[PDB]
């Protein structure tokens, strides 16, 4: 979902990192209360 941006060098760099950091934020927020769980479950 990486926007983007405009540089194939920069897209490849960010695409290997941003999805993982996104997942970490949402998953950790769910374990720290049904709404946070639901956001985590919406991933993938």
């Amino acid at each position: 979902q990486v926007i983007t941006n405009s540089s194939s060098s920069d897209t490849r760099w960010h695409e290997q990192r941003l999805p993982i950091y996104l997942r970490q934020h949402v998953q950790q927020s769910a374990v720290s209360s049904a709404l946070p769980y639901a956001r985590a479950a919406s991933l993938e």
């Binding site: 970490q24 934020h25 998953q27 950790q28 720290s32 991933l43």
Partner: protein
């Protein structure tokens, strides 16, 4: 009074056993879940959550403690008293949700740096029936809503037992700017998903919204901005000029784009 309803909300989860089904929706995802919530005689909360559509994602909690959790929710796992300072809390009327009478609370930001909520609270118990996350223009970013809530009678013990997919289970950086009411929740180190490099993590919250900051070394590389959005969750990455090769600062959370950007551009190394 909205303050009183939010205090009742804060305690409703320890004073009520219940079972129910709810939906969660954002741009790009719609899903149904079931919850079983038992308050034991000592006041401990035992809770099971199960996704009803698609994969059987599951978590079981005993008070704060995750007893088991399915793998797809765990692969990246490493108090409303002050809320009125940053949000205006307003009782705006009455509603009906899942066939039950509710009160409507508007939780409106007192600045541009966070999102507001429309909260529908069950009249009989104070439990949340509906939570709508709204942006600055009043547009819907996410919907959390019960379709049935069965209160009073406690879930039977068999309903609290999960299935097989439920698996039994100082950073030298700071922000120079935060929106009012946000405070550091936690800081820790992880490793880059790609390289050997350590990545610093800082997490922040105001009691309602959370965001996380990731700081990753660039080793002199020319890598530019990035941004992304997943429903209410924004992602912004901005390069930070440093004397150690530059860093990429990524901010992820349920805050407006401009807040994540301003945080990302405000991250600084700690000085001796």
């Amino acid at each position: 009074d909205a303050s009183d309803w939010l205090n009742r909300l804060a305690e409703a989860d320890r004073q009520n056993s219940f079972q129910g089904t709810f939906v969660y929706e954002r741009n790009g995802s719609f899903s149904t879940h079931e919850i079983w919530h038992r308050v034991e005689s000592d006041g401990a909360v035992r809770e099971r959550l199960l996704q009803l559509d698609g994969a059987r994602q599951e978590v079981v909690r005993v008070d704060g403690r995750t007893q088991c959790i399915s793998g797809g929710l765990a692969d990246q796992l490493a108090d409303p008293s002050q809320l009125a300072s940053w949000y205006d809390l307003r009782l705006v009327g009455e509603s009906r949700v899942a066939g039950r009478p509710a009160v409507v609370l508007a939780v409106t930001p007192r600045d541009q740096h966070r999102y507001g909520f429309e909260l529908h609270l069950d009249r009989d118990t104070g439990l949340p029936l509906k939570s709508l996350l709204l942006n600055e223009k009043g547009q819907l970013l996410e919907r959390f809503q019960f379709t049935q809530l069965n209160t009073g009678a406690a879930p039977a013990e068999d309903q609290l037992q999960a299935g097989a997919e439920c698996q039994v289970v100082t950073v030298a950086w700071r922000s120079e700017w935060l929106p009012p009411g946000f405070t550091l929740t936690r800081s820790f180190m992880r490793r880059s998903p790609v390289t050997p490099d350590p990545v610093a993590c800082l997490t922040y919250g105001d009691g309602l919204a959370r965001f996380s900051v990731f700081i990753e070394p660039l080793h002199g590389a020319m890598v530019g901005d990035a941004r992304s959005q997943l429903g209410p969750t924004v992602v912004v990455s901005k390069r930070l000029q440093t004397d150690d090769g530059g860093q990429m600062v990524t901010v992820v959370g349920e805050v407006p784009l401009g807040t994540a950007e301003r945080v990302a551009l405000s991250i600084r190394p700690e000085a001796a």
